[PDB]
């Protein structure tokens, strides 16, 4: 769940 994380939202 990284919809509200850009850091990690490349990953989801």
Request: proline letters at 9%; charged letters at 25%; one cysteine or more.
């Amino acid at each position: 769940g990284x919809a509200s994380d850009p850091r990690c939202a490349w990953r989801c």
